[PDB]
Design a protein around this ligand. Sequence first.
Ligand code: HEM
Ligand code: HEM
Ligand SMILES: CCCCCC[C@H]1C(=O)O[C@H](C)[C@H](NC(=O)c2cccc(NC=O)c2O)C(=O)O[C@@H](C)[C@@H]1OC(=O)C(C)C
Lengths: 53, 446, 378, 105, 60, 79
Amino acid sequence: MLTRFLGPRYRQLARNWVPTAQLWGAVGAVGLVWATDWRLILDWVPYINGKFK
Amino acid sequence: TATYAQALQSVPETQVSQLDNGLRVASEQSSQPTCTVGVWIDAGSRYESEKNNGAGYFVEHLAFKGTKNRPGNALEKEVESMGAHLNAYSTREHTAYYIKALSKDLPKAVELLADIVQNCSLEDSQIEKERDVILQELQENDTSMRDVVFNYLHATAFQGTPLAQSVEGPSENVRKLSRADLTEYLSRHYKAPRMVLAAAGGLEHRQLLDLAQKHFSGLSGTYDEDAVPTLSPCRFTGSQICHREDGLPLAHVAIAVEGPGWAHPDNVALQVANAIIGHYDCTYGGGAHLSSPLASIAATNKLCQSFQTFNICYADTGLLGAHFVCDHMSIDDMMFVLQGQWMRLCTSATESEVLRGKNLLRNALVSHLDGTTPVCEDIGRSLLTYGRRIPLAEWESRIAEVDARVVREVCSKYFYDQCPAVAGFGPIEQLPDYNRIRSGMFWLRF
Amino acid sequence: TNIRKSHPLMKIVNNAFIDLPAPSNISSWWNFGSLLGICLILQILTGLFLAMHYTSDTTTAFSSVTHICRDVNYGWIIRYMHANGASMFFICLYMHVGRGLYYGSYTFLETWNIGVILLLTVMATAFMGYVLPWGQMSFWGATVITNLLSAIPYIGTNLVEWIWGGFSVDKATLTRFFAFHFILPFIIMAIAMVHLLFLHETGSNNPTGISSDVDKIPFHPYYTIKDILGALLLILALMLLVLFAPDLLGDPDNYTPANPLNTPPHIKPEWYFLFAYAILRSIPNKLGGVLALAFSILILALIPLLHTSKQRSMMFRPLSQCLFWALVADLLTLTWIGGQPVEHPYITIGQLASVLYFLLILVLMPTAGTIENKLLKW
Amino acid sequence: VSASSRWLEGIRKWYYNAAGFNKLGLMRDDTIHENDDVKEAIRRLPENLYDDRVFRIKRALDLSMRQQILPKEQWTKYEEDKSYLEPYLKEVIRERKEREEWAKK
Amino acid sequence: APTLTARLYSLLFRRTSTFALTIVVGALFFERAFDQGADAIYEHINEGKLWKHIKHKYEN
Amino acid sequence: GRQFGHLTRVRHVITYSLSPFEQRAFPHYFSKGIPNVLRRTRACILRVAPPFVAFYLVYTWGTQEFEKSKRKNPAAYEN
Ligand code: HEM
Ligand code: HEM
Ligand SMILES: CCCCCC[C@H]1C(=O)O[C@H](C)[C@H](NC(=O)c2cccc(NC=O)c2O)C(=O)O[C@@H](C)[C@@H]1OC(=O)C(C)C
């Protein structure tokens, strides 16, 4: 019954933390990538190709 | 039905006039039978130096003690017998001497002001008597923890600058200042282009101008050679002063961040956010149900006895923050909560709370400008600070402009990841370490 | 002044089982907390004595256990108490969770949740436990199961081989499991204390779900002795197995060493995973089967979000009381099916029991709750 | 008033007797789960109600321990079951909801 | 024209978001460049490797 | 944690009790015991028992059909 949080203010609160929640997923993706040396995603980054010729 | 917007239009324009002195002469006429006139001088203690500090204050104590044409009693006796009220004050930037009086007594009212401001006797025997009264005033002031901590905030925030000084001075100056020290500060600072004759009530502006030209003509008949009373900007310092004393029953803390100063348009928005946080006192009715989250939490959990946000302004700088009072085991919680609120606003101000803040501020403004004295003081002071008088309507427009975004942007600009100036006094063992307070000025989520 | 109260250490002990106020009211269903404790230490205790004789190495694994049973003075009782205590640790774990739902105890979120963490860990532990003797069930038990992570999209393969140390179960896998089977019960033991920490924050729930603050009794006498008797009963049972029926709950074929070539058409995990086993294969899907297997246990952490009733215990709730037993019997069903081959009757009925399980906990009990509210005028 | 309204009443009287708290001398409201709202309403009861509620629950917890029940002629007769906590509970909920509603704008 | 450190603070250090984003973005490039320069330094001071030994055995 | 003395508020209740060394540990063990467990069993048969016989019926029929599915299988294969 999550209706307590349905209103104008909540909508404004939600929107205020949109950039944060976004940038915080950017941190996690890149973070997961860098930590597992994601072969798939990394190949695309210009430098960082320690698996080319 | 006469609307609020419309009501603001009805407030009569403040009339401004300049003499040949450079003395500005301003008034706001109303139907009242009484009034308030006085002179606002662009003189404080930020204008003083290490050695003449307390001079303005020492002058104030002498201002009503006798003039050339009216020695000793005389003044009092003229004022008292005409049933008027003579008063004065001085801050770090301003000095004022005003008279509340029957409006039909505007002619002598002004005459008396002139004399006071121009021919202040300074009889040597008086200077001696006053020396000992001010000393006493200091023993007295030492017991108002609040007065103390605000002097300490100023002392630490603006360390090494004139603004760091107090209005009354250190004891030795009071002990050491001489008549020559005084008169030289007088002539140095009581010059027309820095004075403003202000008035509010049942007068007509022309009558004021006439008087000003009659009793004030000849003050800057000598525009000074190379005396350049210019205020050097004042450094702010993220610093902290703790006057531990477990013999006091309650602690006072005052935390602030550097403010912009009198003229910056950012004030309006800061005042809104301040209104949102507001103030509190243990005699407020309505505890748990207060709109201010800080206030409501403080009331329900007994976090304090009183708190209050504030925004002090000086030229190009100011202290912006809160001051609270509480038990020795609550200093930590109060701080947490205070700070968490500051951040909430920087990053999450919602729309309605801002309306409330704006309305509060509108109420405050209009309510504050009620009666001859409060108005007169606003005229005189504003002329000094804004150069003009900002008509209610304009403030209303400034407030209306503000909404959540403006609050977050403006709050972040001054509070976010900024260095505080902390001042402590009382049983402050639990007052958090400066690093800790510093860390509380940003959020790891944001 | 009474040192039993101000000494940094005793405090804890005073708070644990001396002065702690408890409901004058609890009944036998509250004993399984001590029993689980006892289980945990006794398990740790025999388990250790086996480690002073056990090995690892695939070559000697099986040989060492028999060495213990035959050569090691008294090694047999130790070995069998360990293996039988393991089952008892499940009977109690099972009963505990049971007591919990019926009586609404799960309303203590943190405590309940730590308990779920306690469930998965002893499960994860006991699993590794039986791989050790390196018997037939041990090998494919260790194979049929572990594999499941190979159903995880994109990376399943990688993980299952990473947990293996090779391309199949061998060398790298037995030593691994032994070490993990050694460090886990200690970690569990810690978690238990945190479980118990959060429990002391509210005190115990009781048969009525009402609130006993109005009638608390000291743990001193009362629940210490009612825990002792209780533990004696747990000893009777554990000893009945060990001393009269050692292999009654044990698959006879974990005898006869391993053999990556064989696989004896039958094979099921130890009894306590049967209900789960049944669920998984009652689904024609690699992903779905394992996904459903997970939900089968991870749903406990969902229960509190579907409390719908205005009363806490089911003591006064006939409707739900019925659906509770239907759940138990239905779990007894899944256990039974899990124990049978994937053939004719057995398939469709175990397929129905699965749906029932999830539909009962996810739709039936929550509705029974609301109807009871409505009946009472609440 | 219907022949069938007595049926619904009859299903209710039926459940009541089945639910069983009345054998322990409890009243319907003596068995509500305690939550914030319920705790606040318990707080608002006047002395006598509160004291009576305490005595009841004590009497049940006591019975529950001996695993007994009250003689049949002393069970709480449905319909003589006073809904003493509903009005407070209802008022506590109303004010919470007003708050909840204020927090949205 | 402010300062490097100033401009750096505003655009990336102020918000703990960008602050953290900067370091995960900055760690990836660092691991790569530090491993290059390092190994290179390690080889340059050596040369009895199996690197320069290969040239001899491309055949079998 | 919560200690006695800070639990809750209690009004006007007297509690008489007796020393264990002054009473019997098994008052009317059988006299009052049996009747009561009958009473508690009765009070609960109907909510506990039904699901179990249901399992019971499904268990015996289930194995039955399992044998009669294969063993019984032949049956007839006549040509
Ligand atoms: C390492 C295995 C576990 C141990 C050692 C353990 C220990 C205990 C102890 C000593 C108590 C208090 C006595 C009692 O109520 O019986 C208790 C109560 C409880 N445990 Fe556990 N438990 C374990 C597994 C669980 C599980 C599987 C759950 C549920 C997922 C759980 C959730 C609870 C809850 C909610 C209570 C409160 C019972 C009540 O208040 O009536 N714990 N536990
Ligand atoms: C950290 C204390 C423990 C140690 C040192 C320990 C060590 C061992 C060793 C060396 C074996 C192989 C010998 C044998 O199979 O009899 C074993 C078997 C086993 N233990 Fe543990 N273990 C410990 C705690 C546990 C726990 C917490 C459980 C879960 C109840 C557990 C359940 C098992 C099981 C299921 C087996 C294999 C079953 C069987 O014997 O047939 N033990 N353990
Ligand atoms: C070493 C023995 C000293 C005991 C201290 C540790 C043990 C401990 O904390 O003791 C008390 C006895 C704890 N609670 C209960 O027993 C308990 C609580 C309410 C009711 C009943 N019974 C009947 O209504 C109970 O029995 C309990 O039983 O928890 C055990 C899991 C824990 O054991 C653990 O932590 C392990 C991690 C050691």
